[PDB]
Design a protein around this motif. Structure first.
Motif, PDB file in Angstrom:
ATOM      1  N   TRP A   1    -119.300   9.317 -40.231  1.00 59.41           N
ATOM      2  CA  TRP A   1    -120.171   8.878 -41.317  1.00 59.41           C
ATOM      3  C   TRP A   1    -121.390   9.813 -41.253  1.00 59.41           C
ATOM      4  CZ3 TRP A   1    -120.648   2.749 -41.404  1.00 59.41           C
ATOM      5  CH2 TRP A   1    -119.381   2.208 -41.689  1.00 59.41           C
TER       6      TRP A   1
ATOM      7  N   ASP B   1    -122.437  -1.068 -42.954  1.00 57.15           N
ATOM      8  CA  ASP B   1    -121.557  -0.790 -44.076  1.00 57.15           C
ATOM      9  C   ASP B   1    -121.761   0.624 -44.620  1.00 57.15           C
ATOM     10  OD1 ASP B   1    -119.925  -3.094 -44.325  1.00 57.15           O
ATOM     11  OD2 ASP B   1    -121.637  -4.216 -45.084  1.00 57.15           O
TER      12      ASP B   1
ATOM     13  N   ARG C   1    -122.519   6.615 -49.306  1.00 54.07           N
ATOM     14  CA  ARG C   1    -122.258   5.596 -48.292  1.00 54.07           C
ATOM     15  C   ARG C   1    -121.425   6.281 -47.195  1.00 54.07           C
ATOM     16  NH1 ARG C   1    -118.960   1.078 -47.061  1.00 54.07           N
ATOM     17  NH2 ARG C   1    -117.321   1.673 -48.546  1.00 54.07           N
TER      18      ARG C   1
ATOM     19  N   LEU D   1    -124.725   2.205 -45.436  1.00 51.11           N
ATOM     20  CA  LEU D   1    -125.875   2.486 -46.289  1.00 51.11           C
ATOM     21  C   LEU D   1    -127.096   2.981 -45.546  1.00 51.11           C
ATOM     22  CD1 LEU D   1    -125.711  -0.569 -48.674  1.00 51.11           C
ATOM     23  CD2 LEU D   1    -124.797   1.739 -49.038  1.00 51.11           C
TER      24      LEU D   1
END
Length: 140
Positions: free
Chosen positions: A110, A73, A122, A75
């Motif tokens: 990401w 997700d 995040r 994190l």
């Protein structure tokens, strides 16, 4: 991996402090928490990087042995063992800064990032152009 290959200078022979331009050093706490601190004397900001493949690195706490990793997700967390969530594509940005893209979620860009308040960003909330993804490695 569908990404540019401009790599930052420097070797992995020695540990480093990863200073985010937003004002905090990347920190991996014993309990697996990852955040940032402005205190250079903190004993959980010394990180040893290593290259598993050219441009692909692990980022490990020299104090606790934990590996920086980013979960499903987005994190960041400290992992006791190395897994696919622990590999990052270490790249140069703006011909100067160091950035780290989650290899596992590289398709969505990401990045490892710290907010000005010292909390981690995040994965989905990061993106090119933010000061939060820019790191300046310093000697320990």
């Amino acid at each position: 991996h569908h990404h540019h290959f401009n790599l930052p200078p420097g070797n992995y022979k020695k540990p480093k402090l990863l200073y985010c331009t937003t004002g905090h050093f990347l920190r991996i706490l014993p309990d697996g928490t990852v955040d940032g601190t402005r205190d250079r004397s903190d004993q959980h900001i010394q990180l040893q990087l290593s290259a598993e493949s050219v441009g692909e690195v692990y980022i490990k706490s020299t104090e606790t042995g934990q590996y920086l990793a980013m979960d499903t997700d987005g994190l960041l967390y400290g992992s006791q063992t190395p897994n696919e969530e622990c590999l990052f594509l270490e790249r140069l940005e703006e011909n100067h800064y160091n950035t780290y893209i989650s290899k596992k979620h590289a398709e969505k860009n990401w990045f490892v990032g710290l907010k000005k308040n010292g909390s981690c960003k995040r994965g989905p909330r990061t993106h090119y152009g933010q000061k939060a993804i820019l790191f300046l490695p310093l000697p320990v």
